[PDB]
Amino acid sequence: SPGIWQLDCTHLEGKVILVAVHVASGYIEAEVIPAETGQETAYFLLKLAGRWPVKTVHTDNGSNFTSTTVKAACWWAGIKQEDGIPYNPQSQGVIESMNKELKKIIGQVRDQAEHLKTAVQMAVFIHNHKRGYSAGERIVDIIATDIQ
Amino acid sequence: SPGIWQLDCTHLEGKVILVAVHVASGYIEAEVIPAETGQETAYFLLKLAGRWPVKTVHTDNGSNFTSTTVKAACWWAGIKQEDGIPYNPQSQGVIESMNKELKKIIGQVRDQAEHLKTAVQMAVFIHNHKRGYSAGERIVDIIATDIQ
Ligand SMILES: CC(C)C[C@H](CNC(=O)Cc1c[nH]c2ccccc12)Cc1ccc2c(c1C(=O)O)OCO2
Ligand SMILES: CC(C)C[C@H](CNC(=O)Cc1c[nH]c2ccccc12)Cc1ccc2c(c1C(=O)O)OCO2
Incomplete structure (x- = not known):
């Protein structure tokens, strides 16, 4: 599991927030995009995979799973693309809760x-630094232990 | 040492490439921007500091060192802003060489x-994965050892 990430797309202010969550740690990266297209998702994954050792991505929906551009980026970056079906139903609740939490923080800083x-x-900063360890600490520790 | 980053601005195709280098590992993050402004630099630093534990930034030039927006972002993110003066003159050569290396890779993929x-x-991907260890491996190991 150190290489497993989950995509998550949420909406706010008529805009789209694309999130990648490192499943084992809760660490995230995120961006605002005008709309979730295959192109934007593909570019986001290329950025992510250059920054962390991304082995597997659970895609957020069927359109992105099908997208030829997303498939091209996954090929280029050596990522195994998988579905994001919550076979364990606690998976959706966790992501749902994170989206609410992220939106709450956005409201607190929006000003x-x-x-x-x-x-x-x-x-993203507040989420990854929030402490017991932070998500930032957990991801580094998890990956370092794997490298060894 | 584990928290020290250096900013670097280089040019290609009439455009600006802003780079942050983790000095101890050689790991980088980078973005293309239309022009180096304080605003763009500030936003880039906010992104960086949400993703890695950035303690100190050696700024790339005096305009960014002076910029009130850059200072605001450094305050917000808990970053100590420092100059980027190469007191050890091997510092410029290393960065110069990285810019040439990055431009070479860009040419190789540009197609x-x-x-x-x-x-x-x-x-960025090729740079951080290039092997002995990779820059990606070094930064994780360095930070994990520090956390402990
Ligand atoms: C993963 C990679 C191997 C391919 C993708 C898709 N590109 C192509 O098929 C090549 C291509 C399409 N027209 C061209 C014209 C000239 C040369 C090459 C091409 C790259 C990509 C992904 C996401 C993005 C992108 C890009 C991008 O091309 O810059 O732009 C912003 O969001
Ligand atoms: C570090 C942070 C505390 C301040 C900076 C500067 N912003 C302000 O002074 C607040 C402000 C200016 N007009 C407003 C109008 C309404 C509410 C707040 C403001 C944030 C920042 C940095 C870089 C960027 C940005 C931004 C951004 O404001 O979105 O946009 C793209 O590049």
Whole structure:
């Protein structure tokens, strides 16, 4: 499980927030995009895989799972693309709860940022630093233990 | 040492590539921006600090060092902003060499990507995965050892 990530797309202010969650740690990366297209998802995955050792991605929906551009990016970056079907039904609740939590943080900082994208990055920061360990600490520890 | 990053701005195709290098490992994150402004640099730092434990940033030039927006982002994210003066003159050579290396990789992939930003992210990927260890492996190991 150190290489497993889950995609998650949520909506706010008529805009789209694309999230990748490292399942074992709760660590996230996120971006605001005008709309969830295969192209945007593919580009997001290329960025992610250059930054962390992404082995497997559970895609957020069937359109992205089918997308030729997403498939191309997964091929390029050496990522195994899988479905995101919650065979364990606690999987959707966890993601649902994270989206609510992220939106709450966005509301708390929204005043400090002119643009939503900035607020989202503040939320990523707060989420990954929140402490017992933080998600940032957990992902580093998990990956370091795997490398050895 | 584990928390020290250096900013680096290089140019290609009439565009600007902003790079953050984790000094101890050689690990990088990068983005294409239309121009180096304080605003763009500030946003880039907010993203970086949400993703890695950034303690100190050596800024790439005096404009960014002076920028009130950059100072605001460093305050927000708990980053100590420092100059990027190469007191050890081997510092410039290393960065110079990395920019040449990154541009070479961009040329090698440029054909596989319609847009420069995509080529840059491919270059980040190749740079961080290149093997002995990779930069990705070194940064994780360095930070994990520090956490303990
Ligand atoms: C570090 C943070 C505390 C401040 C900076 C600067 N912003 C302000 O001073 C607040 C502000 C300016 N007008 C407003 C209007 C309404 C509410 C708040 C504001 C945030 C920032 C940094 C870089 C960026 C940004 C932003 C952003 O504001 O979205 O947008 C893209 O590149
Ligand atoms: C994963 C990679 C091997 C392919 C994809 C798709 N690109 C192609 O099929 C090549 C291609 C299409 N027109 C061209 C014109 C000239 C040269 C190459 C091409 C790259 C990609 C993914 C996501 C994105 C992108 C890009 C991008 O091309 O920049 O732009 C922003 O979001």
